[PDB]
Write a protein that binds this ligand. Structure first.
Ligand SMILES: [Li+]
Ligand SMILES: [Li+]
Length: 428
């Protein structure tokens, strides 16, 4: 088993996502933007298994793996395909409701094992796929809730199902020698504060220690999945820098969080886990699909230096940060930009920047009253309301784009914004 499956392999290109991108390009008036959209279709994005039906619907898990085999044969190089394992019972427990089909009180954990993990593992175990490198991102938006959100009944009730579900998933996947396993561990805007950071290190250490292979059960962690947090905040490199008698991390946008970006956060976690007994062979992934923050939106353009306004902490930080969101918890349908293209080992400790969330796919429908005919479990979330306030802090707008289709469906307007705002800009 490789130290890093992204070294010496080319990323899987999902033809179903790429078809949507190319269709968008053909509907794009601006010839420059259209050529950029066309180029985006050539990059590697992850295949999400977000419900039991995803295993067989359309080309299905087998179909994507067969396609990966074809790309491998054509390229004469190993292909690395990324899969997102995302169907825990009481999924996304801190949200008032989730699109996830399984509930703890309705045999959720048992069905997670028997109808979701087991058939996936049976497919991935097929000797036909032995030559691929298969990366599995384990359960976004799960464990970090057990650090910060246990006051919420759906999270407190989900504790064992999350722990036992994730242990089961990893234990079974570890029986397949070409599967590389990365646990999702949120992003800096969730677990950066000292108490959350230490609580997460404790929690994940306990979860992994209880797996069959202990600290050898996983290959690393991933941050920023489907989020927009920059990998680097180059004009705020020092969270303790004094402006107007106060450190810049005291700004309203950060609320004393010592981590402004995913590189610092991911590497700090990696060192902390190594300190707890994880082998130094662990590596971190960062989802850079939508965190470039080029172009202009939310009343600002990308900064090109520290703010000249040193009159207040907030003025300085707000003029210096590349993350332009109104509030760090604004996760739905943001007017961001595509980030760094997928690339292996960009810094020591980082296995790769990857695109897990596929750019252009919606984070959620933008108003209630509209049922998804193809998924009865998809539901409107107020964080996607373009006319609403953040639920995490109602002083701030959601920043969500209007006219969004249900989660996972192609979102023409956001796709154009994401490409136009790409950083570095897309090279057609
Ligand atoms: Li490694
Ligand atoms: Li930094």
């Amino acid at each position: 088993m490789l130290d890093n499956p992204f070294i010496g392999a080319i990323g899987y290109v999902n033809p179903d996502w790429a078809t949507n991108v190319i269709s968008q390009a053909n509907q794009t008036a601006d010839p420059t933007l259209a050529a950029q959209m066309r180029k985006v279709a050539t990059y590697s994005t992850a295949v999400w298994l977000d419900r039991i039906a995803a295993i067989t619907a359309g080309r299905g898990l087998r179909g994507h793996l067969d396609e990966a085999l074809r790309q491998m044969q054509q390229a004469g190089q190993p292909v690395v395909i990324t899969l997102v394992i995302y169907d825990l019972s009481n999924r996304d427990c801190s949200a008032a409701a989730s699109n996830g089909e399984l509930l703890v009180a309705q045999n959720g954990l048992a069905r997670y094992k028997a109808e979701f993990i087991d058939p996936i593992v049976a497919i991935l175990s097929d000797p036909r796929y032995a030559g691929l490198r298969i990366v599995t991102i384990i359960e976004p938006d799960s464990l970090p809730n057990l650090v910060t959100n246990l006051s919420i009944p759906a999270c407190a009730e989900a504790q064992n199902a999350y722990i036992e579900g994730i242990r089961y998933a990893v234990n079974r996947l570890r029986t397949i020698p070409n599967v590389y396993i990365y646990l999702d561990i949120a992003h800096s805007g969730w677990l950066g504060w000292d108490n959350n950071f230490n609580g997460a290190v404790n929690l994940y250490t306990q979860v992994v220690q209880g797996m069959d292979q202990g600290f050898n059960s996983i290959d690393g962690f991933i941050t920023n999945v489907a989020n927009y947090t920059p990998f680097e905040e180059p004009y705020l490199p020092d969270p303790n820098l004094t402006i107007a008698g106060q450190p810049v991390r005291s700004a309203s946008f950060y609320e004393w969080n010592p981590y402004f970006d995913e590189l610092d956060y991911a590497l700090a976690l990696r060192n902390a886990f190594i300190g707890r007994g994880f082998p130094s062979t662990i590596g971190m992934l960062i989802d850079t699909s939508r965190n470039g923050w080029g172009g202009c939106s939310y009343g600002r353009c990308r900064p090109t230096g520290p703010s000249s306004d040193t009159s207040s902490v907030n003025a300085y930080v707000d003029g210096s940060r590349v993350d332009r969101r109104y509030h760090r918890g604004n996760w739905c349908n943001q007017a961001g930009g595509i980030g760094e293209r997928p690339q292996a080992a960009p810094r020591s400790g980082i296995d790769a920047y990857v695109w897990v969330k596929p750019p252009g796919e919606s984070d959620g429908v933008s108003q209630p009253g509209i049922v998804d005919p193809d998924d009865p479990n998809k539901k409107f979330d107020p964080m996607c309301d373009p006319n609403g306030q953040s639920r995490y802090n109602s002083a701030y707008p959601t920043g969500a784009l209007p006219n969004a289709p249900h989660a996972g469906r192609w979102f023409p307007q956001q796709s154009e914004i994401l490409v136009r705002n790409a950083y570095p800009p897309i090279q057609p």
